[PDB]
Amino acid sequence: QTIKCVVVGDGAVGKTCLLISYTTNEYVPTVFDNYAVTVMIGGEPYTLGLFDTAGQEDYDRLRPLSYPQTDVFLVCFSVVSPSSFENVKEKWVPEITHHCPKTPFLLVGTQIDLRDDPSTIEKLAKNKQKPITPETAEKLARDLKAVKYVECSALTQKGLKNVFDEAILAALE
Amino acid sequence: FVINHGKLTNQLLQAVAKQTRNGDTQQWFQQEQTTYISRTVNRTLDDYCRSNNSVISKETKGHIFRAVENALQQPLDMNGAQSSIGHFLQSNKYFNQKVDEQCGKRVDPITRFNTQTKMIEQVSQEIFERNFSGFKVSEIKAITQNAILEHV
C-alpha cells in the first residue's frame, strides 16, 4: 500500500533539500536514500514512498528507470529560476507524460523564500528576468494538465507538509 | 537470501533496450558508470562529514572529485547520487519477490520499505561490480578516503 512519489525537475531546483527537509520530521547528505513515512489523511494512515532523481538532470538514459509504478510525480521548478519553470513545460512534463501518461503530477514551485530577496531579483533582473508568480504558475499547471500547483520552501518549511499531503491526495484515485 | 544477479542484469539490460530501437546499451552503460561511481564518492564524503561534523567547501569537493577522477581514469560528476540500477530494482518483480521472502513475518509498510531499500543498496552494488569492473566499490571508497585525507 506504499504510494510511490518521485521528485523530478532541473538541478539547482533543490529537489534533494526538499526531501531531506521533509524527512527531518542532523547532517544533510548529498545522497538521499529512498525514504517512506506514514501520513494521516482523513483519519487513515497512508505510507508515502519518496524517491529522489537528483543528479540525473542530463543523463537521459538513466531517468526512465525511475518511472515504472510511479503513483504521483512532483514536477518541480525554482520560482527564482525562469529556466527551470520553462523546462517543466519543455522537458519534464513531456517526459513523464511519455513514460506515465496516466500518472498524476503536481506542479511544484520551490525556493519561494528567495522570491523576497533583492540580491536574487537583482541578479535575476540581469538577463531581463523576474521571479515566477503563482498566477503565471497555475496557467502552466493548467496548460500541462497538472492535477494542481503548490509551492513551498525547504528552508522555511512553509507549505512543505502541504505539498506532500496533496501528493498523497492526488495518488489516491 | 540468494538472487541470480545475472538474470537481473539481463532484465535491466532489456529495460534499457526499450529506450532506442537498436537496443543500444552503450550510452546507458557510460552514464550509469560515472553516476554510480560518483554517488559512491559522494556517499563516502557524506559519511566522512557526518562522523567528523566537518564541512567541506564545494571547491575542496571538486579537488576530491578530480583526484578520484584521475586515480580511476574515469570521468565523474560531483552531482551523482542516484543509480538507475537501484531504481530499476525498486519496481522489478523478481527482485521484489525476494524482498517479500526476506521480510518474512514482517509487513509493516515501513519495515518492508526499509528492507527494500537496504536490499536495493546491496544488490545494485553486486550488479555494478559484475558488469562494471572498472574498479570495485571498496576500492572506490578507499581511493576517495585517501583523497579526503590529502585535500581535507
Q: Distance (Å, rounded) from C-alpha B11 to C-alpha B26?
A: 16
Measured in angstroms, the CA of A16 and the nearest CA of chain B are apart by 10
CB atoms within 10 A of CB A125: 12
- What is the CA angle A139-A141-A143, rounded to 5? 65
CATH among 1.10.4120.20, 2.60.40.10, 3.40.1440.10, 3.40.630.30 for B1-152? 1.10.4120.20
Name the closest residue on chain B to residue A1, using Cα atoms: B109
Determine if residue A53 is labeled as part of a ligand binding site: yes
Q: Distance (Å, rounded) from C-alpha B140 to C-alpha B44?
A: 9
List alpha helices for B53-108, DSSP H. 58-72, 84-90, 93-103
CA gyration radius, chain A: 15
Q: Distance (Å, rounded) from C-alpha A166 to C-alpha A144?
A: 18
Q: Distance (Å, rounded) from C-alpha A159 to C-alpha A139?
A: 20
| Rounded alpha-carbon distances, angstroms, from residue B5 to A62, A108, B2 | 19, 38, 9
| Rounded alpha-carbon distances, angstroms, from residue A58 to A24, A65, A145, A146 | 28, 14, 24, 23
Chain B within 8 Å of A103 (Cβ-Cβ)? Answer: no
Q: Which three cell numbers stand for residue B14?
A: 532489456
Closest residue to A55, CB basis, from B81, B88, B113: B81
Header resolution in angstroms: 2.3
Closest residue to A2, CB basis, from B53, B85, B109: B109
Determine if residue A3 is labeled as part of a ligand binding site: no
Our measurement of the distance from residue B133's CA atom to the centroid of its chain's CA atoms, rounded to an integer in Å, reads 13
Burial readout B21-48 (b: 16 or more C-beta within 10 A, e: otherwise) = eeeebeebeebbbbbbbbbbbbbbbbbb
Chain B within 8 Å of A44 (Cβ-Cβ)? Answer: no
Contact in structure between A137 and A159 (CB atoms under 8 Å)? no
Asked whether the beta carbons of residue B84 and residue A61 sit closer than 8 angstroms, the reply is yes
Closest residue to B77, CB basis, from A33, A47, A55: A55
CB atoms within 10 A of CB A144: 18
Residue A142, classified by CB atoms within 10 Å of its CB into exposed (0-12), middle (13-18) or buried (19+), is exposed
CB atoms within 10 A of CB B118: 14
Domains and CATH numbers, chain A: 1-173 (3.40.50.300)
Residue A47, classified by CB atoms within 10 Å of its CB into exposed (0-12), middle (13-18) or buried (19+), is middle
Residue A165, classified by CB atoms within 10 Å of its CB into exposed (0-12), middle (13-18) or buried (19+), is middle
Return the H-helix or E-strand segment holding B148. Answer: helix B137-151
A69 sits in the region (left: phi over 0; alpha: psi -120 to 50; else beta) called: left
- In chain B, what residues touch A68 (CB-CB under 8 Å)? 91
